[PDB]
Amino acid sequence: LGKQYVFSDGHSSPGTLSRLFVSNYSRQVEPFDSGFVVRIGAAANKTGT
Numbered sequence: 001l002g003k004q005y006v007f008s009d010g011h012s013s014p015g016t017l018s019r020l021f022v023s024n025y026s027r028q029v030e031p032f033d034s035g036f037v038v039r040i041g042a043a044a045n046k047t048g049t
């Protein structure tokens with residue numbers, strides 16, 4: 001199954017830009033054992049939240 005990472009838009013208002021909105025990915029450290037592969041853009045051209 002691997003691991004899922006999701007990015008989001010920052011806080012926005014009509015005519016205004018506000019603080020960013022992210023998860024706690026920066027403080028997580030993963031072991032690099034033999035490398036990894038990344039699947040990118042699998043859910044393209046679809047309605048998403």
Ligand SMILES: *[C@@H]1O[C@H](CO)[C@@H](O[C@@H]2O[C@H](CO)[C@@H](O)[C@H](O)[C@H]2NC(C)=O)[C@H](O)[C@H]1NC(C)=O
Pocket residue numbers: 024027028
């Ligand atoms: C990053 O955030 C995730 C999601 O909240 C944290 O995972 C939770 O950690 C708490 C505290 O130990 C546990 O009680 C929950 O069961 C965890 N949830 C899941 C889904 O794993 C995670 O610890 C955070 N990483 C940090 C702070 O380094």
